Amino acid sequence: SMTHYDVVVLGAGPGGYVAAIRAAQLGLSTAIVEPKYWGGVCLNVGCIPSKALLRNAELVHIFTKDAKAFGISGEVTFDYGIAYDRSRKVAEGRVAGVHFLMKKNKITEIHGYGTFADANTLLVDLNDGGTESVTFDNAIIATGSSTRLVPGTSLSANVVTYEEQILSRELPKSIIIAGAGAIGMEFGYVLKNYGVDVTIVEFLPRALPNEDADVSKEIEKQFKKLGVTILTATKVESIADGGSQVTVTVTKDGVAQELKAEKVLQAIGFAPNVEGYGLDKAGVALTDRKAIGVDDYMRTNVGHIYAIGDVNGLLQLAHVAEAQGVVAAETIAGAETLTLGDHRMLPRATFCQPNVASFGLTEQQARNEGYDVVVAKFPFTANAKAHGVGDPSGFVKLVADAKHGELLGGHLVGHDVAELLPELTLAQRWDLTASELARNVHTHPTMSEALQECFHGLVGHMINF
Amino acid sequence: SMTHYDVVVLGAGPGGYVAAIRAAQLGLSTAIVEPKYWGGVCLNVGCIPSKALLRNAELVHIFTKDAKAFGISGEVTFDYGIAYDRSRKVAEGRVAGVHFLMKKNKITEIHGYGTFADANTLLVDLNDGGTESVTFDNAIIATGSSTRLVPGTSLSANVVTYEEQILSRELPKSIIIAGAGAIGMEFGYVLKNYGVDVTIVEFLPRALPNEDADVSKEIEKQFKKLGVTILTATKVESIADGGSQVTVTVTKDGVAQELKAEKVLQAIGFAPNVEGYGLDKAGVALTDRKAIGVDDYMRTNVGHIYAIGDVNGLLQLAHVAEAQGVVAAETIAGAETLTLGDHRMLPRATFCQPNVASFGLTEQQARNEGYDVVVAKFPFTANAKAHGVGDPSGFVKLVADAKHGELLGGHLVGHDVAELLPELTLAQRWDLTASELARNVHTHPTMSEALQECFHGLVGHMINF
Ligand SMILES: Cc1cc2nc3c(=O)[nH]c(=O)nc-3n(C[C@H](O)[C@H](O)[C@H](O)COP(=O)(O)OP(=O)(O)OC[C@H]3O[C@@H](n4cnc5c(N)ncnc54)[C@H](O)[C@@H]3O)c2cc1C
Ligand SMILES: Cc1cc2nc3c(=O)[nH]c(=O)nc-3n(C[C@H](O)[C@H](O)[C@H](O)COP(=O)(O)OP(=O)(O)OC[C@H]3O[C@@H](n4cnc5c(N)ncnc54)[C@H](O)[C@@H]3O)c2cc1C
């Protein structure tokens, strides 16, 4: 078969399927090509099921640590197999949801793997073995990324990516997680709570090393108290799968040590999917770090080909991929659009308990860049609902420029603080300062009141602390 | 014993103690008079302990009724006695915090009950037995409110207000609650989850009658499945306490009906405390509904006397009282401030599960007032986080004026949606439109994403529904 579309989308993750919806809304005939995962990594083996598992693990944590406090009597047991099953039900529901949205928007689904032949044509190897050719006026590449392996190591039966681990109904006795980013922590949290022995190795001197140092310290303390072992400033040298166990050679301070465990999880980063589908034929240029290069409108060096989501390596998160997809489709149609701006300002979160949530500049980053830095910090031990909820740990930390009280960054750790970010990002985007923000009344009692107190701290004096 | 202060606050609830802090920060020498409740109703027997109890009740529901879904096994029971005990610790902890804040801000605590003798003099019956006269330049009345009883009814052994009820360690077999406001629904939710059979009697034809109609219906549906009986359009006309049971005569037109239970809770509302402390001798005028009259700066008819919090009847919530206290103290100091404005725009929430949270106008209010009304509604069944957490019910409903996309109201029901209001009220308070709100990128996966979907809905079309 041969057909022509205004827009063809490569990949059906949050980037692609949203970009496709948006193009269809703006009146463009749209097709979307995907061989495996509708809803991409996020809906099938990423954000969606993992958040279901973390919820289960939180309930375990609540019991095994706070049963006495909440007046719980009983020997209560938690089957991981049921946590697993529920994670699959939840993923399956949303994937079906994607299909509903494609149909609602009259978007043509093409089930196969797509490869550029020219800058205007796409060769698709269909899953049933056949072929079809799609010619397009515009293409939106949303092919995502794949796991980056520790150099010189490989995958095997007991050395896995997020993908094999998140799909395991059965659980290992012990695991070593390479990398202490968002995904490494979240997996560490779920597995430990469910009885697995967990060791996490990070090369940089901090867990969650992109976060504010005050946040890294807080989350490390919580994990050590949970019983997870975190090795920082430590380099994975080699990984040996001996069947009955995995042997991980590790160096710190010029001292090699061996760590053993049943399994090893590789979670040190994600490399953009860029090879094997004809970017060269299309004339699309890569960056130094082998991501697809793009301007502020997600346009590649080829005027009519766009690149959105993890494949551009700018900030590998689903909400980013969604927003870039919307940018790309509006630019194609000629519709009114706004670029995302500096991606450092975009919000980010980790969903273990305590939650981690942030946007913009850390305290130290702000000082290093020449700002007149003001900082306000409010511990959740001074918040009424945090005590009411049983988790007074953590804090809200804002950093601003003193001249006008403009927000440069927000850094939160505590119970479900991921939900508290939008007031901040809204303020940052539309130039609302601490002084305007301090005049927004917050409902009592919520965790959100800690935001109000920080706003006050920036302009002068906190009340409740 | 004589003494003098620039400002004397009467009452130490949220309104009083925050007013005193803000006054201290502004250089004014400050005293605060309170005989029983430091932190007032809110911290001692109101918001704070009740939120702890609701947390406990939430966990009861999950560990019993949702046990199988979460793979929870074993025989498990919850002791309400421990839920009570924890609520008391949480309360005393916050009450302690109030004393520290007084001490930090150099506020003089007067322990006793104050009565006005004139417009500039206050007589205090001290708890230690003595007395002392206090003279002042500015007074801030923050004397709170008291439960209003169903007309022609009486408190007794088995007919209580929130105060006796929340301080009970043991539970009754049955209870009838008069009033389907926030306090009634919250006691309804706690007690039902702990196995009490609960009946709620509301005179108006809806539960939570001040919310949007869609919200009232949804929460009624939720309470029904919980096993709470709600009787709407129903007038309580007599309560007879037989010692071993209580007889409630009820009228759902045009017929009388008898309801029986071990206890009855009166929760139909609150009347400002304006009697027995010399308001007449200071020349402080009362409104029609017997609240203390005030202007937009909380000034009474006596220029140097202010009334904040529940005593002015404007909106009986803790965050409102705090906010008014700041306005009062700031106006007194000759400091910059901003009046709260139309109190309908202030946020409010009910903290059962699912939460109810709202601000501004209901849809039908906006239509009646001649707005060109746009309404966008997003259900949480289409939200990833909601499924992952195990509570996909409820929705987010926004209403706006079609001219510029200005928000008029927001109305949320669902898991912990109280935390989602800040973005919305900041937008309304600074005239940010739906178009600008739609560009604020929300972290995935969060309940907060439901907001972003609604913003897009107000602008044109939603993506994920
Ligand atoms: C365990 C885990 C947890 C995560 N949790 C979160 C979280 O909580 N919050 C968050 O924001 N992010 C989270 N992420 C990240 C998130 O998964 C990604 O940001 C997101 O999936 C990116 O969307 P995408 O469309 O850009 O790429 P993808 O989601 O990977 O979708 C890309 C798709 O393109 C397809 N494709 C590739 N090549 C071709 C081709 N030649 N032809 C056709 N199709 C092709 C692939 O099959 C794939 O389905 C998590 C990731 C993992 C691994
Ligand atoms: C069960 C329950 C749950 C609630 N939950 C919430 C909630 O979740 N969120 C929310 O926002 N609100 C909630 N409220 C309402 C909230 O408690 C009140 O709005 C708030 O306490 C008002 O603060 P206030 O300072 O204005 O008055 P108060 O809190 O009542 O404090 C007033 C104080 O003044 C003192 N006083 C009175 N007369 C004198 C005098 N002559 N001399 C000296 N002192 C005097 C009293 O002793 C009292 O301590 C709840 C109320 C109840 C009953």
Ligand SMILES: COc1ccc(NC(=O)CN(C)S(=O)(=O)c2cc(Br)cnc2N)cc1
């Ligand atoms: C009426 O039928 C339906 C079926 C499905 C939907 N919508 C969805 O399922 C919705 N997404 C698929 S989603 O998984 O929740 C999601 C994914 C991402 Br990435 C961002 N936001 C959402 N809401 C709406 C309506």
Ligand SMILES: COc1ccc(NC(=O)CN(C)S(=O)(=O)c2cc(Br)cnc2N)cc1
């Ligand atoms: C150093 O010791 C402390 C500990 C805690 C505090 N602050 C508090 O306890 C704080 N309030 C008493 S509170 O109950 O939480 C509260 C009540 C109201 Br009304 C609004 N906001 C808050 N935070 C101060 C000092």
